[PDB]
Amino acid sequence: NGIVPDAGHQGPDVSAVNGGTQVINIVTPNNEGISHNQYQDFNVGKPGAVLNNALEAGQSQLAGHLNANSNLNGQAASLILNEVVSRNPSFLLGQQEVFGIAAEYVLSNPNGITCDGCGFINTSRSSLVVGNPLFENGQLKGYSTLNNTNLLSLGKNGLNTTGLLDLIAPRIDSRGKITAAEISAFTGQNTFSQHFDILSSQKPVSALDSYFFGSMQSGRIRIINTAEGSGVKLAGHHHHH
Amino acid sequence: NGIVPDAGHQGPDVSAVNGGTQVINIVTPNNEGISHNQYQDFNVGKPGAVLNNALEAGQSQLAGHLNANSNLNGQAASLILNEVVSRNPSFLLGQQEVFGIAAEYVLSNPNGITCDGCGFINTSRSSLVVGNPLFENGQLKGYSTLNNTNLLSLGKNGLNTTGLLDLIAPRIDSRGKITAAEISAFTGQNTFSQHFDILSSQKPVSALDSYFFGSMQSGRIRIINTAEGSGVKLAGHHHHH
Structure with missing residues (x-):
């Protein structure tokens, strides 16, 4: 059970198929087109995980044949926002696939995210945010890495996608091959708009080298620290003191 | 004599001061504001080199007190374009300073450019181009790295500037600290506008990894290959076969 949904109204339904591949029936999108999913734990193992954004049954690359997501109600998500609300960091050791209608993907975990052999299938854009989403008046306003020194780590097995990729964290430590249509790495302690415009920046108490x-x-x-x-x-391959 | 001007009408006057610092009285700017200087050899040693873009006498950081450049005729250059027209590569082992009115700086050498401890003083933008400028109807149209596999090498002593920096080459091999207001590294076999918009790209016969x-x-x-x-x-620090 690498993925554990929050018990509240934004917790999606999560199950697994043979091999261990997890399937997430994401929550109904809101009026902004955002399926806002909250988790106590979000981790992907070698078998990977599927986010079900499908209006009709079909073939998933990671899980095989799957039914449509009955949470959708005729309208697929434009953005699938996965927010870890606890203090647990995330480890992504396999692929994640948006099954059905291609969408933007975000995983936010201010405790840290480690990728090692991860990747993103059928996403127009995927963003890994070591930070929190910001909501005001019920709407997504952007993201914050303020007051945070945690890492976005990318291991020797790398990260692959054919969509756009955003790496958003106080600091990044990458040791493998990153493939993407475009790579944007924005580091430091910042606030961001929902489009990852940098709106403000803090001077950290100590150095945040990536x-x-x-x-x-x-x-x-593009890299901006x-x-x-x-x-x-x-x-x-090592950075010794 | 690291810097040897072409004998023709775009060859500037070059002399040296105590310590070996070279001083270039760049040619009169044309109607585009470009001082287009052509060289048989362009190399900078540890003592550095000064490009005289001054309308009045004053103090150069690298060379001390200097007279105004009488080639200017009341109008300083907006862009100082230094073009190596021979087959000799360039080695930049010290600082280059635009004395007088700050300007944009370009060094083009399709045979290769090596920086090691180099830098650029009083430049709003400095561009190192392992390629040739393109002229049509007497005007600067842009630059070309087409059909070229030569390197822009940056050594362990690095490259420093407080202005913008463009690194434009078939491939780059950098081993030191690069500091600049912004770093843009555009690699591969390309044509460019005068603003370094990528206008076209070739598939190289063999790999051009940077x-x-x-x-x-x-x-x-920003890096674009x-x-x-x-x-x-x-x-x-090494890349072994």
Whole structure:
């Protein structure tokens, strides 16, 4: 049970199929088109996980044949926002697939996210946010990495997608191959709009250097570290003191 | 004599001061505001080099007190374009300073450029182009890295500027600290506008991977490798076969 939904009204239904692949019947999208799913734990194992955004039965790459998601009510999600609300970090050790209608994907976990052999299938854009979503008056206003020093770690088995990729965290430590249509890595302690415009930045109490080793295969790479006194280190497979 | 001007009408006057610092009295700017300087050799040693864009005498950081550049005729250059027209590559082992009116700076050398401890003082933007400028009807139309596999190398002593920085080459191999207001690295075999818009791209005969080791300290980093079958490698201090 790597994925454990919150017991409240934004907790989706989660089950597993043979091999261990988890299937998430995401919650009904709201008027903004956002399926806002809340979790006590969000972790993906080697067998992967499927987010069911399908209006009709069909074939999932990771799970096989699947039924439509009856939570949808005729309208698929535009954005699938997965928010870890507890203090548990997330480990993504396999692929995640949006089954059905392609959508944007966000995973927010201010406690940390580790990817190692992860990836995103049938997503137009996938964003990993070591931070929290910001809501005001019931609407998604953006995201915050303020007052946070936790890591977005990417391990030696890398991260693959053919959609856009955002890596949003106080700091990043990447050691593998990242493939995406475009890679945007925005680091430091920031507030963001829902589009990942940087709206404000804090000076951190201590340095927030990000480290990249491995490779990047993409059409465009953009890296912005807003933290004063910090930078982007391109090191080898180890970074010793 | 690291810097040797072309004998023709776009060859500037070059001399040296005590310590070996070279001083270039750049050619009169044309109607586009471009001082287009052509060289048989362009190399900067540890003592550095000064591009004289001054309308009045004053104090250069690298060379001391200097006279105004009498080639200017009351109008300073907006862009100082330094074009190596021979087959000799360029080695930049010290700082380059635009003395006088701040300007944009370009060095084009399709044979290769190596920076090691180089930097750019009093430049709003500095661009290192392992390629050629393109002229049509007497005007600067842009730049080309087509049909070229030469390197832009940045050594362990790095490259520093407080202005914008463009690194434009078939491939880049960087091993030091790059500091700039923004870093834009556009690699592959491309044509560019005068603003470094990518206008076209070729598929190279063989892979053109770029390698970065060291660090980047900047407000924004953008990397675009247009070469199919190639990528951006973040390796350690060596990249062994």
